[PDB]
Design brief:
- The structure is a homodimer of 810-residue chains.
- Chain A has 2 domains: 483 residues, Glycogen Phosphorylase B (Rossmann fold), CATH 3.40.50.2000; 327 residues, Glycogen Phosphorylase B (Rossmann fold, 3-Layer(aba) Sandwich).
- The radius of gyration of chain A is 27 Å and the shape is globular.
- Chain A is 48% helix and 15% strand.
- With 810 residues, chain A is α/β, with parallel strands linked by helices.
- The complex binds ligand 18O (4 copies).
- One copy of the ligand O=[N+]([O-])c1ccc(/C=N/NC(=S)N[C@@H]2O[C@H](CO)[C@@H](O)[C@H](O)[C@H]2O)cc1 sits at the interface of chains B and A.
- One copy of the ligand O=[N+]([O-])c1ccc(/C=N/NC(=S)N[C@@H]2O[C@H](CO)[C@@H](O)[C@H](O)[C@H]2O)cc1 binds next to helix 6 of chain A.
- Chains A, B: This is Glycogen phosphorylase, muscle form.
Amino acid sequence: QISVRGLAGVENVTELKKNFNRHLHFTLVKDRNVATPRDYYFALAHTVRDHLVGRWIRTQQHYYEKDPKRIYYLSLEFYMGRTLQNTMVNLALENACDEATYQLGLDMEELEEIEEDAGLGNGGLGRLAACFLDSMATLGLAAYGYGIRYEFGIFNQKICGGWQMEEADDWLRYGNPWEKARPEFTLPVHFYGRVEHTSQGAKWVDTQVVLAMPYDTPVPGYRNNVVNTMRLWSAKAPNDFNLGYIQAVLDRNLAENISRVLYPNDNFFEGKELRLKQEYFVVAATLQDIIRRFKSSTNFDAFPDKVAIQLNDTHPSLAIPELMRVLVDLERLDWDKAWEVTVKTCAYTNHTVLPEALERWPVHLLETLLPRHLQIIYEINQRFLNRVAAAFPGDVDRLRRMSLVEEGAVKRINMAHLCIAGSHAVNGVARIHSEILKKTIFKDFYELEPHKFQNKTNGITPRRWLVLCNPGLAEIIAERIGEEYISDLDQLRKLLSYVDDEAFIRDVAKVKQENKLKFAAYLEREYKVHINPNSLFDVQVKRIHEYKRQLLNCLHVITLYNRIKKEPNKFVVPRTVMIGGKAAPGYHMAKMIIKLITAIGDVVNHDPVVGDRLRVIFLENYRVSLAEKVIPAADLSEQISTAGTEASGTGNMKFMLNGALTIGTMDGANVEMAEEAGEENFFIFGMRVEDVDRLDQRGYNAQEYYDRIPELRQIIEQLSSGFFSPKQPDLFKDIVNMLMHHDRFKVFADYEEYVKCQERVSALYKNPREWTRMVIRNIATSGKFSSDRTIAQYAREIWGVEPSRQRLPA
Amino acid sequence: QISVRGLAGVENVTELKKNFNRHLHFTLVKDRNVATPRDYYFALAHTVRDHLVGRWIRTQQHYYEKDPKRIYYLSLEFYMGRTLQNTMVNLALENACDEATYQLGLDMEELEEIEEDAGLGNGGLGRLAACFLDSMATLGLAAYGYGIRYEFGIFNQKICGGWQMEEADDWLRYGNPWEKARPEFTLPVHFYGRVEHTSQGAKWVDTQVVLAMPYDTPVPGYRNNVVNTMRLWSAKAPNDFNLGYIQAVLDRNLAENISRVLYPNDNFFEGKELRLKQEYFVVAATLQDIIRRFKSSTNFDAFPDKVAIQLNDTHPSLAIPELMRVLVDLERLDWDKAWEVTVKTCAYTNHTVLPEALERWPVHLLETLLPRHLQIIYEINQRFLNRVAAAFPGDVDRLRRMSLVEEGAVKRINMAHLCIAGSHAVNGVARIHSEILKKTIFKDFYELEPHKFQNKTNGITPRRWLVLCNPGLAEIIAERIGEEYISDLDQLRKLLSYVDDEAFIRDVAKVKQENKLKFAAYLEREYKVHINPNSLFDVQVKRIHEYKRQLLNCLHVITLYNRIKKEPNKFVVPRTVMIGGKAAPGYHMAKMIIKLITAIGDVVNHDPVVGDRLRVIFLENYRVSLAEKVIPAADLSEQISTAGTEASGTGNMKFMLNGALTIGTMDGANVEMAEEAGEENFFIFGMRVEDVDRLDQRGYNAQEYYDRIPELRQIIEQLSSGFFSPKQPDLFKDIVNMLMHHDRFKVFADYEEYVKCQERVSALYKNPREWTRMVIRNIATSGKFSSDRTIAQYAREIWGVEPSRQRLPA
Ligand SMILES: O=[N+]([O-])c1ccc(/C=N/NC(=S)N[C@@H]2O[C@H](CO)[C@@H](O)[C@H](O)[C@H]2O)cc1
Ligand SMILES: O=[N+]([O-])c1ccc(/C=N/NC(=S)N[C@@H]2O[C@H](CO)[C@@H](O)[C@H](O)[C@H]2O)cc1
Ligand SMILES: O=[N+]([O-])c1ccc(/C=N/NC(=S)N[C@@H]2O[C@H](CO)[C@@H](O)[C@H](O)[C@H]2O)cc1
Ligand SMILES: O=[N+]([O-])c1ccc(/C=N/NC(=S)N[C@@H]2O[C@H](CO)[C@@H](O)[C@H](O)[C@H]2O)cc1
């Protein structure tokens, strides 16, 4: 049907149809009479996956023959979403499969909806890893993602009585067609035990062993025939485990719990032993695999020439002392050489400055679980502090500030400090974030080793986040500038030549309208919720956090409602305000925010005076597959975190690429987005970082804002008095108390500017032609935010490897 | 190579080779450079399984169209062993696959060794179910085996320091190519809760729900294109289970533990809650599935015309009150009609008379776990006892004897009594066993309802137990009488015409010698144990139990050793005495018997005076795949249980079919084997049932035997004094004490006759020609013991269906 979706050749369609029928018969053991829609999905998945196999084998064979430097991306999170469409896109099979299924009497889009998200991540950090794997494959890098195969991913969110309920995400229930178990590469991981010192060095003994079984998932590049590997480890008990008899077998569950479930905290640290076990488990199994592959190329001098390890936050920080352990204890290298190799091998990416998100492991936990690693960490710390002492003689406070060991009630290891000491490069994820790292939380480290500190502004893959989720936009773009932009997103700049082109303006607006109609119908069918598709789609989707200020959005929503009630017969630009996102199950305030949103909807959506002019909808179960639907439908992207708190954001970039305008603070990547598009083409409001700092120095007094803004006072009084919870008048007391007395994120301080800026948004939306021209200006300058650019920078400036757009033979 | 293994057509071989290569590539994601022997096994398994699919679908479609009466065989055990060779045999693919793999440069026999046994059974009862499924398919019956998919089957046995160690049988680790998950037929099973009485009857409420997910395994008939189904249930938690958050997800293990592990007790009852849960789980899920299939044919009058349920022992006895529950509580049938349907539907097979093996569930367990079933059982008992009271007025002791409810310290439900009351047929598994049921333990029930009591002598499938494990014997037989005997084993009688045929005698003896050489080499390679292949192979393989009297075998072995030591330069017929079998992990005496056997070996096998004249080997990890190797190699089959204790035995029949002579008591099926072959062609010794009874009446005094048999006294003194355990002189005190003072199985009473009978065996073995002629007489009369005969009898006399040898179209 549409060009960017590839060719539907006679030969290809015929072949797909017969392979589809073969799988239905031989693989699913069904015929057309008993086959369910799920069977049809599986037959298609198997049919498509067959096309990956030859390329997957030949890519890995290529890397064996050429022996390039290998990149190991270590993450506890890979937020992959669905795989079927992505695979078809990258293999140019989409139109052929659409035709083949059509001729079999099936609707491919319906089949696509059956696939579970691989929800092995919480949010931005997890999805960043996924985008990165796609870009690394597209850029022909010999890259491997290593993580954990969680049996349960991020929980499915249900809204009951306006409250979040969690249910287990049993995503493997029907089997995963996109993985291959690799039991022959099963590796032992050690826990507990004790350290013995011999004549011939330290030895870690009396350990408990858990097996790490790998599962390989293919990562196809965009039409370059490259298929890289994501290897995820699953925990398995050894067969003599606990080996009255019955209980010993049942106790195997204890070992296997390691890979059972993803911890559902976004930007928050919980010092739980099971989490520590997961972190070591992925690190220990991965490093053995790396070394095995390296030996099958004795001399570890060349190790950093053949291996790069990227640490996605501090979660896999134990790679540093684990590499030291292997090199020193097992390979018998001297400390200084082992350390040189380690530093040259590892690089660390920081993803947050929020203090509650930083990993600080109690010493007593490491002592019990990983006694040898603790000793190695102490030694690293001693040698590191000796360097600090020589660089800054007499500066005793610097020594305690920089120590990997934090003194206090409970001694803790600062994992961030460990990562900086043991890495040749440390990067933040947006220019302002990286500057804040050098200026504030890692200032001491920057002063010691300035050369280590870099920026690598985040990006998103334009395969998933344009071609896949918004084929209509991808097509009208390709009609004008060709298809090359899909793997060279900077080419979108050519669209600036069409900003006055009446045909293009009409087409951009038409694609948006179609996306909105499609999403409005999705809402009715799957959720019985009715919306006006001619309204401005005002969307804030992201994890629920105080720093992300969903609460500020709520205050705007109530302001609009109160203004309508005040002057009912005055014209207002109609809005559909959509807010979605999961709250961490232990995060009370986030759960209260969700309840507030639904409570506001309950009042607003049933007020006859309001009509279809204002609707407030909570988007349930926000996840990658939902993002792919709502983002193309959005008009307005809410990116309203307090300046200095969102390290980068990536949702922001997704919206920019898909034709929504942005209202946001100068925070994270918003700054660079505004710089690329021009500040005139962005809705910027609120305190800058410096303004926040000034306010902190003076002391933030929320009462002052309450006293001086009558519209804000009204809202607080409505909240307190029970306007939004009539049968439970004090329901929102915690929220009011926080806003009034303990607001770390200064919701009130940005309120006036936010509302005024929102008025400017509504004014522009009244003029469809000028709204769309500004949209074109955003899409046209969104090129910098491709993860291909990001990965090319990692490759050149950190990993020391050149990307290649060259095809492997088919 | 050999005829019975089928044709190796040019077309077939070419096709197998390309499908093998296809699976290696697309299924295993390997090429020949990296492929391991396990990959090669899997490629072959997938290649062979492809041939089942069309027949499997068309068999089930056939049953839907024809709607025959369906047979449901309910068992907690299916001891299947390996599936690859069995499938090739039944599909006539063995020579084609052998040729295809040969041309690919692979040895098929080596690949076959890679497959794990499906070890979902303990011993005879579990393997009986497996033989039965094979026969039901071969006889064209619309039959389904229903059981539990245990994640862990019978433990792997390791011998360490002469002691049994258990390790988890993680048989699913590499995946099972012979199953298809059927998540669309997932069903809820209820536990706990409470009973509410309404105007509209009883209701079972507030239950905990566990999901039952079915996995289907094909059961091919012998060359008739019939493929039946074995459906095994796996336990799954519902997604809102326990739904702080992390623990709730980890707690899902509690629900799923139901299908985790097979209870490893052979002929012994342990009243554990988890076992009860397993029993109800299989019953509840199965009955819902049966009813669903029945409705997709309102009127339950026709239920018994369309459904037979066979209860394999009392393990699935809850089917009776579960059927009543569904019919009465859910379908709203009156009690009397529900009961009529239930009785006409269910039949019960008893597998033991040992009192410690009988299931007697504490009332307090049923009260908590299955409150509604307890009420139904009480009601069944009341109505049943009212019938007894009317039939035998005034006989109050009969009333308490026949009650389903046992009074005492803890009230218990006698599950055997439940099964008799609720079944239209009750059968024992060999003529003497069925007679003992009517005469002793179920005498009261027989007097009340004589028509219910039947015999169905056990059998074994000649596919696995001749063609598969002994192709050489199968071939020399087919050369003379054709191939028809494989599904009509009575035809073996034609071999009586060859008892004087010199060519046949030579061939029978040659096949045995080859089998012995092959097994002697298996022992050296896999276990570094060296044996004389010219010795008599004296084999006792079966679970370790006091009733099976491995101890009596031990006493014979020591007698032989002592006699050799006494007269070292006298000629004796050389023997290799092999004993193997697992002990239940909690059964102390059985574990001591294993230690004794290894301890005897340690002395005997290293005595220079003995030389190669006597060797004692403990066969480690006895299981179906090992049986297939050792049974064809055996000369002498030890079947030496105390008369009246082995209900049937089936190992006995396996040996008879494979050319071993039998030394045994007149117990279980041995009686019918001797009757078929002629008592002159059997080595019968020892007390009959009546002699045991006489001895019990008088009182068994072991001391009397010790006092009068000097050779027996010597052995006991050697055991006591530490002759067989020099560094632990009292190691075997428990064994001596048991033999001397508390021997329920009268080991000493059969000792003299046993030893004398063993002398007669040795005498015959000295004359190879006459040994072999007697062997031919055994093989020739082994036809009765085909499970095809057994199943044809069940079909005609219990299930009310006619077997059919007619082919379905290919
Ligand atoms: O994505 N690709 O390109 C891909 C992935 C896998 C294969 C081959 N796969 N081959 C096997 S046998 N896959 C198995 O399938 C089971 C579910 O059916 C899984 O539970 C199991 O973990 C997995 O190993 C081939 C291609
Ligand atoms: O379960 N635990 O214990 C856990 C889980 C996750 C975290 C941290 N999660 N951290 C995230 S998701 N960080 C995000 O990273 C994105 C990509 O750079 C940025 O765009 C974004 O600004 C930033 O907030 C911390 C602890
Ligand atoms: O024996 N036959 O005839 C047979 C059995 C199965 C199939 C088709 N099978 N098709 C699938 S997708 N099999 C899956 O495979 C996984 C391991 O790879 C298992 O873990 C999983 O339980 C199983 O359902 C086809 C034929
Ligand atoms: O784990 N639990 O709780 C358990 C397991 C098994 C049993 C009983 N297992 N019972 C057996 S294996 N019975 C056997 O049946 C064979 C077939 O008829 C006969 O040939 C043989 O004579 C007879 O002993 C009892 C309890």
